Design a protein around this nucleic acid. Structure first.
Length: 63
DNA sequence: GCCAACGTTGGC
DNA sequence: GCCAACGTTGGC
């Protein structure tokens, strides 16, 4: 399976109330502190910064 | 039918 | 006016 890319943090939070109670949200904090909620916005950032090692498939958005 | 990406909002 | 919660939904 997938592992957290180097210097990044993966935060998983489970919803407790409402219709979506039981659902999980996954977000990633970059080593620079930038908070990401989607694989799209992340893949977008990696492209603009010239990433040659970390691929958007390396960041698991499933829990 | 139902969930990825993003949208809204109550409660400071 | 911001943000951590949950809501909404297009499109697979």
């Amino acid at each position: 399976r997938k592992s957290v890319p180097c210097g990044w943090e993966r935060v998983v939070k489970q919803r407790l109330f409402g219709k979506t109670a039981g659902r999980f949200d996954v977000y990633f904090i970059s080593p620079q502190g930038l908070k990401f909620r989607s694989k799209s916005s992340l893949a977008n950032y990696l492209h603009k910064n010239g990433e040659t090692s970390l691929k958007p498939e390396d960041f698991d958005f499933t829990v």
